[PDB]
Design a protein around this ligand. Structure first.
Ligand SMILES: Nc1ncnc2c1ncn2[C@@H]1O[C@H](CSCC[C@H](N)C(=O)O)[C@@H](O)[C@H]1O
Ligand SMILES: Nc1ncnc2c1ncn2[C@@H]1O[C@H](CSCC[C@H](N)C(=O)O)[C@@H](O)[C@H]1O
Ligand SMILES: [Zn+2]
Ligand SMILES: [Zn+2]
Ligand SMILES: [Zn+2]
Ligand SMILES: [Zn+2]
Ligand SMILES: [Zn+2]
Ligand SMILES: [Zn+2]
Ligand SMILES: [Zn+2]
Ligand SMILES: [Zn+2]
Lengths: 251, 254
């Protein structure tokens, strides 16, 4: 198992994200630019007017049903360790509105998780069957924020005239992780996924532009490959799945 | 000396900024919203196209003569400790272009200081004569990044129509940072005719030249307890009713 990179993120994450290869002689992928945060090429007129934010007036740690930001989210879904509550609907997730800089609360309040960024020790690695994949180097408990789907924010019109469509996440707007992305660009499709994407609003609340946060759907054991469900639009064009699920819907 | 706030920044800075009042019964200022980064109300079309960034191809920690981002800045002005080189012209500062996310270098490279944020221990306190000032609670060596002037980025024509002009920083199509309604610790810094702070125009995540960010660097050793001051400049005093109270033997606006 060769270490082909000590950190594909080049110090932009809280931890390094190594790339190893125990399978063949492919070096670390280098046909893209690692970015830890979403970027644009042509302008995207995101509403950043600070007076447009809805915000809370809490004097505590935003753990009460009075928090506006929790109400926008239906309730605050976060426990004190930043994990999704057991009652969180993994099959049909709500929008999460995290607290923001217009709010009266402190930066350490309960309702702040995704804005704190990636924490789990993850690793790019060569799979036997589906190119590069990502795995966790540690146990991740259920409902943990794992990573954000980061890339280039583009319009659907711009997406349609792109040659490569394998790194597209639909938000109509898209995140294309082909030329610019983070570690998420490498996560493989799985039919019984250990990650679910959740739409999240933080510094802005322009509803055209959710941020896409992956949360664990169960305990993810150390060494295990990360996967999420690419959804039906992807397979309608890309259809065989090699996830190896007894319940695989696309093989 | 009453402590009237643990931290006026509510945990948004690396360090807390307490407020104390040992002069009167004024409570902690609360007629403004503290923000640790610049904001807008009306849209500012900042060029944020990632392909418009100039960037470097450095294979080291950007400490060599060859750093392209250093070249944009004339040279990189930071030493190993993030302090401005002794050769830095405080009387006529260059534009600084810090490394960005488009550079080939690592996030811990030498050419990254302002983007790392406020680090010095500061305090909002009640002055006897000039209401609310900011002091340092530690010695700050010369050429250290102290704080950024943050507030609401607005056009010159929006600044013209506002009643409160006392928290305006002019940038250089002209734009201003208005810290009246939304600002950080810097909005509380008093004017001084021999200032221990100098504003430097800095570029980080974008290089849209209409929108520099304003970083205050120390002009000399500031000692523990010393009030911060910068020179508001002549435009300000040409308008401003009252005379300067900075108390400098060389005051120019007395
Ligand atoms: N479950 C699966 N079965 C077979 N191939 C898959 C797969 N999930 C992802 N892939 C492959 O990976 C692409 C998605 S991008 C994911 C990272 C990719 N393995 C890489 O090396 O860059 C798909 O278009 C497909 O080629
Ligand atoms: N050197 C100086 N002499 C007299 N007044 C000053 C001064 N420097 C700052 N001020 C006062 O502070 C204003 C700038 S904003 C600085 C913070 C201010 N002391 C506050 O309590 O909010 C000026 O318009 C003036 O009212
Ligand atoms: Zn709240
Ligand atoms: Zn909160
Ligand atoms: Zn809130
Ligand atoms: Zn499958
Ligand atoms: Zn460099
Ligand atoms: Zn650099
Ligand atoms: Zn650079
Ligand atoms: Zn003076």
């Amino acid at each position: 198992e060769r270490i082909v990179s000590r950190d594909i993120a080049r110090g932009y994450e809280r931890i390094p994200i190594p790339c190893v290869n125990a399978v063949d002689s492919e070096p670390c992928p280098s046909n893209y630019k690692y970015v830890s945060q979403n970027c644009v090429t042509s302008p995207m007129n995101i509403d950043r007017n600070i007076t447009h934010l809805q915000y809370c007036v809490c004097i505590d740690d935003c753990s009460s049903s009075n928090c506006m930001c929790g109400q926008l989210s239906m309730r605050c879904w976060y426990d004190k360790d930043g994990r999704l509550l057991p009652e969180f609907n993994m099959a049909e997730p709500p929008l999460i509105f995290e607290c923001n800089h217009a709010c009266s609360c402190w930066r350490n309040c309960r309702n702040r998780v995704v804005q704190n960024g990636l924490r789990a020790r993850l690793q790019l690695y060569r799979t036997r069957d589906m190119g590069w994949g990502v795995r966790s180097l540690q146990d991740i408990p259920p409902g943990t924020f794992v990573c954000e789907y980061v890339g280039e924010l583009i319009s659907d019109s711009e997406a349609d005239v792109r040659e490569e469509d394998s790194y597209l996440f639909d938000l109509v707007y898209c995140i294309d992780a082909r030329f610019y992305g983070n570690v998420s660009r490498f996560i493989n499709h799985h039919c019984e996924p250990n990650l679910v994407p959740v739409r999240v609003f933080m510094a802005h609340q322009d509803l055209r532009f959710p941020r896409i946060a992956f949360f664990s759907t169960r305990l993810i054991e150390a060494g295990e490959q990360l996967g999420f469900d690419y959804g039906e639009r992807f397979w309608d064009i890309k259809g065989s799945c090699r996830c190896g699920s007894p319940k695989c819907r696309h093989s």
